[PDB]
Design a protein around this ligand. Structure first.
Ligand code: SF4
Ligand code: SF4
Lengths: 169, 145
């Protein structure tokens, strides 16, 4: 598959990063209290809430405090795009200033949506290429251009015919 | 307007027939026997009046056919509650001044008088519960009180 910028141990390192992920959950707004370590020790940042302009610098600072490798999950419509708050005091999306690895729609998403985010990120790390050491090899990261989750799940979603009528619990 | 047996002693003048809730008109009276159902007679009258509308103004053109359809339902025994009140509102709102010419007040004069005097036939027409909505499967209806 395509990537954007001796082999078994690379897979072992990817596996070690995959099943050992320490998140730093950012509070921000209602997405956090739905979905419920120092930033130096954490390697995944979960941004769950509105990026207010007064505390976008706080988000960027605590992102820069984290160390390589670092991944970002953006939970909810606010962190994805600004959501319903396209207003003067809101930054329209986390990805305006820090790079995002997984996006989770919802307002708020379910906790199981966060768990699915963790799986998606887990194979995202599992088939990525990162340098072994600072002196040996190519010092560049290679994220995998994965097939989109809506392209993969297209056939089963379109094949849906009938749903339960909304007059019941 | 229809008049009863008690009005038969009225002199055929404009003022006396006007004071009784009718008008002298052409002074060519028509007698109705007991074998004639008033709902069928008024249905015939309104069918004539609705198809002889000139189509210019809304209340005659579009409310006389509504009275025709209500009277057809009452004649077939398929009347529903609110039909007599709809007829009375049609009679009130097609009176002198509401329509462009005098065709529609003359149309609603017999319906007025037939409901006023022989109301029991009109209420005998009502046999079905009121409904103009069918059920939509996934939508619970707003059950009005
Ligand atoms: S996406 Fe919705 S639930 Fe989440 S922080 Fe924004 S307003 Fe709150
Ligand atoms: S009331 Fe007179 S003007 Fe109005 S549509 Fe009827 S016939 Fe025509």
């Amino acid at each position: 598959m395509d990537y954007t910028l001796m082999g078994k141990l690379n897979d072992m390192v990817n596996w070690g990063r995959k099943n050992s992920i320490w998140p730093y959950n950012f509070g921000l707004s209602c997405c956090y209290v739905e979905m419920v370590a120092s930033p130096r020790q954490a390697d995944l940042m979960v941004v769950a809430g509105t990026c207010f302009t007064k505390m976008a610098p706080v988000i960027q600072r605590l992102y820069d405090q984290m160390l390589e490798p670092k991944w970002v999950i953006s939970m909810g419509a606010c962190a994805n795009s600004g959501g319903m708050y396209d207003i003067y005091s809101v930054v329209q999306g986390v990805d305006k200033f820090i790079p995002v690895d997984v996006y989770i729609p919802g307002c708020p998403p379910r906790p199981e949506a966060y768990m699915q985010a963790l799986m998606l990120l887990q194979e995202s790390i599992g088939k990525e290429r990162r340098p072994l050491s600072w002196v040996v090899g190519d010092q560049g990261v290679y994220r995998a251009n994965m097939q989109s989750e809506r392209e993969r799940k297209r056939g089963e979603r379109i094949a849906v015919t009938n749903l339960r009528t909304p007059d019941e619990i | 307007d229809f008049l009863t047996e008690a009005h038969l002693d009225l002199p055929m003048e404009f003022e006396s027939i006007g004071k009784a809730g009718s008008r002298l008109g052409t002074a060519l009276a028509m007698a109705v026997d007991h074998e004639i159902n008033m709902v069928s007679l008024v249905r015939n009258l309104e069918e004539f009046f609705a198809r002889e509308s000139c189509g210019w103004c809304t209340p005659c053109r579009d409310g006389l056919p509504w009275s025709v359809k209500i009277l057809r339902a009452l004649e077939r025994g398929e009347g529903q509650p609110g039909d007599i009140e709809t007829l009375e509102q049609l009679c009130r709102f097609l009176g002198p001044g509401k329509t462009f010419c005098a065709h529609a007040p003359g149309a609603v004069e017999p319906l007025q008088s037939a409901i006023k005097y022989f109301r029991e036939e009109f209420e005998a027409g009502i046999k079905q519960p009121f409904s103009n909505t069918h059920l939509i499967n996934g939508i619970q209806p707003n059950l009005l009180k």
